[PDB]
């Protein structure tokens, strides 16, 4: 009732999060977040 | 077939001049500093074996087969006698004789913004491209200067994109690293290879 149920809930929630993380609306925002970080990384060296 | 008569042999300078192009118009803060840093690195690393001089006069008109002598005398008061073309040719022989000295030469002329403007001449200089990864980084950099460069940001972006559209085979070396050091040792290694090759 406690350990098995919590394991099942934990697994189902992690699977749901993994499935949702690869939708287009979230992947498109992650790509933007990565692109801005990449631009800043280059701009640092250029101001140097 | 004497309409053009391209000669098989041309007398190029003994040592190919080193010229920087990009990432924007020469004469604006970003380009001047981006090139100044490399010039200082080259002077310091190759001290005692390199000569660097600024070429104030124009250079894009390094022709060979225009006429026997366009403007031989300055007192003719002709269209070319009163012009500054003779200054360009005089700088051409100056570069030729300095390359004759066998020591490395680097040009600081502010009239180069595309290798295609100096590809059909006799000098055939070593084109060095200091490119910026993306337009956003360049325009951010320009914004970091102030309003004075914000005024010319439009033409700076235009020249940047036009020079990027130039294909890589047009240039001789590329400097795309965002770190000043890595580009410095890249150029240093290339010039060390050139020095070891011509000795």
From Swiss-Prot, chain A:
It comes from the Eukaryota. It is found in: Membrane. Phosphorylated in vitro by CaM-kinase II, PKA, PKC and CGPK. Residues 37-48 are annotated as: Binding to the beta subunit. Isoform Alpha-1b-1 and isoform Alpha-1b-2 are expressed in the central nervous system, but not in skeletal muscle or aorta. Expressed in the cerebral white matter, cortex, hippocampus, basal ganglia, and cerebellum. Voltage-sensitive calcium channels (VSCC) mediate the entry of calcium ions into excitable cells and are also involved in a variety of calcium-dependent processes, including muscle contraction, hormone or neurotransmitter release, gene expression, cell motility, cell division and cell death. This alpha-1B subunit gives rise to N-type calcium currents. N-type calcium channels belong to the 'high-voltage activated' (HVA) group. They are involved in pain signaling. Calcium channels containing alpha-1B subunit may play a role in directed migration of immature neurons. Belongs to the calcium channel alpha-1 subunit (TC 1.A.1.11) family. CACNA1B subfamily. Multisubunit complex consisting of alpha-1, alpha-2, beta and delta subunits in a 1:1:1:1 ratio. The channel activity is directed by the pore-forming and voltage-sensitive alpha-1 subunit. In many cases, this subunit is sufficient to generate voltage-sensitive calcium channel activity. The auxiliary subunits beta and alpha-2/delta linked by a disulfide bridge regulate the channel activity. Interacts with RIMS1. Interacts with FMR1 (via C-terminus); this interaction induces a decrease in the number of presynaptic functional CACNA1B channels at the cell surface. It is linked to Neurodevelopmental disorder with seizures and non-epileptic hyperkinetic movements: An autosomal recessive, complex and progressive neurologic disorder characterized by severe neurodevelopmental delay and developmental regression, epileptic encephalopathy, postnatal microcephaly, hypotonia, and non-epileptic hyperkinetic movement disorder, including myoclonus dystonia, choreoathetosis, or generalized dyskinesia. Disease onset in infancy or first years of life. Each of the four internal repeats contains five hydrophobic transmembrane segments (S1, S2, S3, S5, S6) and one positively charged transmembrane segment (S4). S4 segments probably represent the voltage-sensor and are characterized by a series of positively charged amino acids at every third position. This is Voltage-dependent N-type calcium channel subunit alpha-1B. It comes from Homo sapiens (Human).
Curated annotation (Swiss-Prot), chain B:
It comes from the Eukaryota. Expressed mostly in brain, colon and ovary. Residues 33-183 are annotated as: Mediates interaction with the alpha subunit. It is found in: Cytoplasm. Regulatory subunit of the voltage-gated calcium channel that gives rise to L-type calcium currents. Increases CACNA1B peak calcium current and shifts the voltage dependencies of channel activation and inactivation. Increases CACNA1C peak calcium current and shifts the voltage dependencies of channel activation and inactivation. Belongs to the calcium channel beta subunit family. Component of a calcium channel complex consisting of a pore-forming alpha subunit (CACNA1C) and the ancillary subunits CACNB3 and CACNA2D1. The channel complex contains alpha, beta, gamma and delta subunits in a 1:1:1:1 ratio. Interacts with CACNA2D4. Interacts with FASLG. Interacts with CBARP; prevents the interaction of CACNB3 with the alpha subunit CACNA1C thereby negatively regulating the activity of the corresponding calcium channel. This is Voltage-dependent L-type calcium channel subunit beta-3. It comes from Homo sapiens.
